[PDB]
Amino acid sequence: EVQVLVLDGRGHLLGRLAAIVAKQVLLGRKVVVVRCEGINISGNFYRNKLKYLAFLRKRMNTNPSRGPYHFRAPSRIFWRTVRGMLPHKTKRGQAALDRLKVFDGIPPPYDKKKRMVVPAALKVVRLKPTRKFAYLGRLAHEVGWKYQAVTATLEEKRKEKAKIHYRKKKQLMRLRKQAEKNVEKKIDKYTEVLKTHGLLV
Amino acid sequence: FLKQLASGLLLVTGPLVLNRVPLRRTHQKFVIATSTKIDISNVKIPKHLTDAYFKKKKLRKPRHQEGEIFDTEKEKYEITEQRKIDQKAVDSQILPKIKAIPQLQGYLRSVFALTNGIYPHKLVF
Amino acid sequence: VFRRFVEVGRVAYVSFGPHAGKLVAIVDVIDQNRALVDGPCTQVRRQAMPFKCMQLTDFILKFPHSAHQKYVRQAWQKADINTKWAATRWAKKIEARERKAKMTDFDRFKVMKAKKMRNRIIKNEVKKLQKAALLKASP
Amino acid sequence: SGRLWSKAIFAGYKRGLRNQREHTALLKIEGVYARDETEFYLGKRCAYVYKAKNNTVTPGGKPNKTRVIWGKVTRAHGNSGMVRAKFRSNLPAKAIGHRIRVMLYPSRI
RNA sequence: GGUUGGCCUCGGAUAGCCGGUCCCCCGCCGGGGUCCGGUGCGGAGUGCCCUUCGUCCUGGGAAACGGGGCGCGGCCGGAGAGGCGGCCGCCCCCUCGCCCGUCACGCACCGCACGUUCGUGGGGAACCUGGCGCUAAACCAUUCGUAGACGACCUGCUUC
RNA sequence: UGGGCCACUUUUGGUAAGCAGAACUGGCGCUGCGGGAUGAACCGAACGCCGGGUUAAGGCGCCCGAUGCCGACGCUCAUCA
RNA sequence: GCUGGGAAGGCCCGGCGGGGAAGGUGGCUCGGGGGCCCCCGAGUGUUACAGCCCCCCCGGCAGCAGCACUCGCCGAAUCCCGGGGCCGAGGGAGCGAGACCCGUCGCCGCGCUCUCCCCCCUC
Numbered sequence: 054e055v056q057v058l059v060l061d062g063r064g065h066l067l068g069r070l071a072a073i074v075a076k077q078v079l080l081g082r083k084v085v086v087v088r089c090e091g092i093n094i095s096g097n098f099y100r101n102k103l104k105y106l107a108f109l110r111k112r113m114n115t116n117p118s119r120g121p122y123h124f125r126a127p128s129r130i131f132w133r134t135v136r137g138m139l140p141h142k143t144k145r146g147q148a149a150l151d152r153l154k155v156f157d158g159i160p161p162p163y164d165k166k167k168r169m170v171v172p173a174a175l176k177v178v179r180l181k182p183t184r185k186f187a188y189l190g191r192l193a194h195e196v197g198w199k200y201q202a203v204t205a206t207l208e209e210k211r212k213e214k215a216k217i218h219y220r221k222k223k224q225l226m227r228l229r230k231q232a233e234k235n236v237e238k239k240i241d242k243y244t245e246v247l248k249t250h251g252l253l254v
Numbered sequence: 255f256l257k258q259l260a261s262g263l264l265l266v267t268g269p270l271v272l273n274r275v276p277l278r279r280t281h282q283k284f285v286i287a288t289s290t291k292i293d294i295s296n297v298k299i300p301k302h303l304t305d306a307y308f309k310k311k312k313l314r315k316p317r318h319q320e321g322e323i324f325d326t327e328k329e330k331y332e333i334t335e336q337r338k339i340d341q342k343a344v345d346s347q348i349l350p351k352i353k354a355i356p357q358l359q360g361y362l363r364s365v366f367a368l369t370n371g372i373y374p375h376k377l378v379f
Numbered sequence: 380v381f382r383r384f385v386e387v388g389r390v391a392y393v394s395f396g397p398h399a400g401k402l403v404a405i406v407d408v409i410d411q412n413r414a415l416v417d418g419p420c421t422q423v424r425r426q427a428m429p430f431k432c433m434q435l436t437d438f439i440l441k442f443p444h445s446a447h448q449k450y451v452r453q454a455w456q457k458a459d460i461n462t463k464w465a466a467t468r469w470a471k472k473i474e475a476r477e478r479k480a481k482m483t484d485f486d487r488f489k490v491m492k493a494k495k496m497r498n499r500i501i502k503n504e505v506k507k508l509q510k511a512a513l514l515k516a517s518p
Numbered sequence: 519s520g521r522l523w524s525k526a527i528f529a530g531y532k533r534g535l536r537n538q539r540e541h542t543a544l545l546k547i548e549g550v551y552a553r554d555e556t557e558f559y560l561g562k563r564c565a566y567v568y569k570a571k572n573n574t575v576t577p578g579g580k581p582n583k584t585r586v587i588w589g590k591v592t593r594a595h596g597n598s599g600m601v602r603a604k605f606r607s608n609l610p611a612k613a614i615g616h617r618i619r620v621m622l623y624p625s626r627i
Numbered sequence: 628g629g630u631u632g633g634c635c636u637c638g639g640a641u642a643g644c645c646g647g648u649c650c651c652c653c654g655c656c657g658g659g660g661u662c663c664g665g666u667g668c669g670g671a672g673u674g675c676c677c678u679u680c681g682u683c684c685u686g687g688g689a690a691a692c693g694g695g696g697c698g699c700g701g702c703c704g705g706a707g708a709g710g711c712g713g714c715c716g717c718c719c720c721c722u723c724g725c726c727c728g729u730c731a732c733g734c735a736c737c738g739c740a741c742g743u744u745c746g747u748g749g750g751g752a753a754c755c756u757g758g759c760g761c762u763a764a765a766c767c768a769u770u771c772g773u774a775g776a777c778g779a780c781c782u783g784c785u786u787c
Numbered sequence: 788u789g790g791g792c793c794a795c796u797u798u799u800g801g802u803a804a805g806c807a808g809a810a811c812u813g814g815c816g817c818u819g820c821g822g823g824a825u826g827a828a829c830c831g832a833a834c835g836c837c838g839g840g841u842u843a844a845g846g847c848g849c850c851c852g853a854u855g856c857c858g859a860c861g862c863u864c865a866u867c868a
Numbered sequence: 869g870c871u872g873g874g875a876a877g878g879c880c881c882g883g884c885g886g887g888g889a890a891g892g893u894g895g896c897u898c899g900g901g902g903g904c905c906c907c908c909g910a911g912u913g914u915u916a917c918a919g920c921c922c923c924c925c926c927g928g929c930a931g932c933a934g935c936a937c938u939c940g941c942c943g944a945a946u947c948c949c950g951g952g953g954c955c956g957a958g959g960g961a962g963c964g965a966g967a968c969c970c971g972u973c974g975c976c977g978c979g980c981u982c983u984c985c986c987c988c989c990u991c
């Protein structure tokens with residue numbers, strides 16, 4: 054679509070979410086992924102940590118400053134995973150990669166906006182409940198990431214402000230339900246039209 | 255929709271009062287037939303309303319070969335008084351049947367559009 | 380935690396497959412994945428059926444397992460499921476979802492008009508309630 | 519007073535992995551994510567509308583910078599709602615991931 | 628050169644959830660314990676909101692505690708990238724705008740495409756038009772030697 | 788032209804060899820194309836310049852066309868799967 | 869159309885019955901609960917205050933590879949209609965008038981008239 058797609062990274066498997074996001078950006082869609090620290094990877098944590106430590110070992114022996122760049126932030130880790138699923142050495146792939154914005158936590162532009170979910174990449178449906186998984190935030194923290202604590206504090210601040218918004222939203226909805234009861238005689242004419250056509254059961 | 259003409263073109267009137275569409279020809283391949291219908295039986299569509307009636311007319315370019323003085327006159331197409339009489343005759347007997355069932359004139363008065371939620375293949379017309 | 384159980388006489392709603400949208404009664408169970416399934420009053424003859432296309436309802440019929448279709452129909456007709464089903468919120472949401480899909484262009488226009496007036500009257504009254512509740516002057 | 523056309527995306531050309539057939543294009547129509555739903559759009563006129571630098575004549579209007587390459591949907595591609603389209607001229611590769619309009623013109627309904 | 632309405636947000640669980648209400652505890656709202664509902668999610672994103680032909684006579688309903696002012700002035704909230712959102716005071720106008728009807732009219736351009744928006748779009752020179760405002764540095768040259776292959780770098784140059 | 792080489796199978800020397808030597812058919816050499824990421828020999832198939840349809844072998848998370856099937860039944864957790 | 873001249877199945881409480889049982893109904897016994905009355909578990913066993921399988925002395929009705937989507941192979945035992953896509957190569961087809969304005973022509977399949985009556989709409 055023409056609008057930006059904002060996806061919540063919590064509870065989403067890394068590769069499965071990256072595959073969906075990669076095809077979306079190749080189709081001209083702007084995608085924003087927030088809470089990349091909440092992304093999950095299947096398999097126990099130690100095993101997934103070994104995979105990144107093996108990644109850390111791959112470096113140019115002659116000059117590591119030129120070699121593979123190992124990004125430790127969860128947002129950049131997810132960004133690199135998507136980059137491995139795009140033709141990033143062509144102009145089409147670079148254009149697609151520039152349509153992806155990745156964030157740790159939820160920054161102020163997107164904290165006030167509704168966030169989508171990809172069921173085909175969710176851990177609850179894609180992974181057996183008895184299997185072990187790893188958190189991208191924990192994996193990032195123990196391999197070099199430096200902002201797990203500050204992101205946690207800011208995410209806790211954001212959650213407190215969101216609860217206040219939800220209580221106002223719930224108070225507004227309660228008032229709307231009371232309003233519907235109050236004006237029922239002057240509404241049943243239009244209520245009946247809605248019911249005949251499947252709206253407002 | 256009133257009748258199909260001898261060339262297969264459809265004769266349509268959106269009651270000119272309702273949506274400013276006169277008695278006009280149209281092509282069935284470029285229309286969407288909705289399921290809502292009004293009974294226009296026992297109405298009289300005038301006999302002279304044929305393809306020759308609705309066929310376009312032109313002026314240029316007789317008695318004139320070299321174009322130095324513009325022949326762009328007449329371009330204001332004029333509604334023939336016969337066309338107004340025929341439009342008045344058909345509408346006078348279709349409009350009452352449109353007014354019979356509720357809020358059909360308002361339906362004819364609005365235009366059709368695609369909203370970002372709906373898709374044409376999912377729509378029942 | 381669990382309230383709805385696969386059992387003999389349990390009425391299930393078919394979500395997809397050749398018999399989607401029908402109600403069936405579970406007559407017997409086989410191999411954990413399939414069940415002997417029979418809807419005599421809903422036009423589903425006895426046959427195997429995966430548990431994946433079933434969605435259990437709250438209705439349980441009383442008949443012995445692997446009983447003949449006649450006894451299942453008698454149990455289905457006595458305390459009839461068809462009328463009880465149609466009265467549930469589950470069924471009338473299915474029906475409401477069906478009539479909304481079959482809504483024509485004219486009906487969409489009239490719904491758009493009714494919704495417009497209904498929302499303006501409701502949203503007026505919301506403002507009035509808000510303004511009224513705003514008069515709170517007390518220690 | 520309305521969009522009057524369906525939103526579609528020029529995903530790419532009909533192709534193998536290592537061979538590209540540019541004469542036909544694969545379009546992704548919004549809201550059509552299964553092959554059985556592509557029946558409505560078969561034969562429908564599709565247009566790639568873009569802008570250029572020099573003015574060009576507009577049918578029934580003053581010249582402007584809008585250009586268009588017309589086409590039509592030919593058949594369904596795959597099982598997930600893709601359609602194949604033929605345009606009078608092969609679509610430029612710069613249009614991949616951009617808007618294609620499906621006109622609804624040749625209506626069969 | 629793209630685009631052809633918007634969605635302004637609980638936290639989350641999934642062998643469970645969501646909503647509402649009386650007592651208890653926290654300084655008038657949250658937090659718990661009852662109790663009542665919903666759960667193939669209907670307080671539903673398979674959703675919601677807005678909905679565009681325009682006017683003229685003309686009645687019934689909705690409202691009338693209303694609307695709209697790039698009208699001013701004041702205030703509050705937002706810092707993770709706040710680049711945003713909200714509330715008052717005064718003023719200035721419409722009784723219109725929303726639904727159902729009456730009444731006719733508008734280029735009805737004579738079947739036809741790129742129509743319809745964002746949009747007063749982004750960027751660069753330049754003219755006119757008013758108000759409020761500003762009057763600086765960098766580099767070279769010189770000097771220094773905490774520096775130095777050359778560049779580069781650290782320094783000084785009318786005042787007490 | 789009279790340097791050949793490779794593969795299934797049979798087969799001699801050798802511990803063995805992408806080694807050396809035979810038999811048979813096919814191939815590469817002389818051959819492009821689809822597939823095997825990549826590759827003389829493998830699998831499919833051999834080629835004038837094109838449009839449409841359909842396939843072979845091979846595939847259909849994304850790169851990268853195609854499962855975005857409410858696919859079926861099981862097995863498997865690996866701190867070198 | 870064929871098949872095991874389909875297999876199952878539906879209705880006729882299938883009726884006169886017989887037998888078998890168990891993933892055991894009722895009842896009874898034992899063990900745990902709700903205000904000596906009502907539930908759950910474990911035994912017993914042959915209808916009971918459910919049902920299941922086989923044989924019948926025999927079945928009857930409908931339907932029939934089902935428009936209650938359980939499981940096939942087919943069409944001289946097969947026809948009708950519709951939609952989308954690509955394409956339009958060729959250019960003197962006249963045994964006839966003795967062609968004359970441009971061969972509406974060959975093969976094939978049909979209709980009417982040179983027979984007469986009616987019938988139904990329409991002028």
Ligand SMILES: [K+]
């Ligand atoms: K435009």
Ligand SMILES: [K+]
């Ligand atoms: K020779």
Ligand SMILES: [K+]
């Ligand atoms: K020789």
Ligand SMILES: [K+]
């Ligand atoms: K055809």
Ligand SMILES: [Mg+2]
Binds near residue numbers: 790
């Ligand atoms: Mg030689």
Ligand SMILES: [Mg+2]
């Ligand atoms: Mg030799």
Ligand SMILES: [Mg+2]
């Ligand atoms: Mg050898």
Ligand SMILES: [Mg+2]
């Ligand atoms: Mg050798």
Ligand SMILES: [Mg+2]
Binds near residue numbers: 816
């Ligand atoms: Mg050679």
Ligand SMILES: [Mg+2]
């Ligand atoms: Mg050869």
Ligand SMILES: [Mg+2]
Binds near residue numbers: 818833
């Ligand atoms: Mg070859």
Ligand SMILES: [Mg+2]
């Ligand atoms: Mg190859």
Ligand SMILES: [Mg+2]
């Ligand atoms: Mg390989």
Ligand SMILES: [Mg+2]
């Ligand atoms: Mg081809």
Ligand SMILES: [Mg+2]
């Ligand atoms: Mg591949």
Ligand SMILES: [Mg+2]
């Ligand atoms: Mg693909």
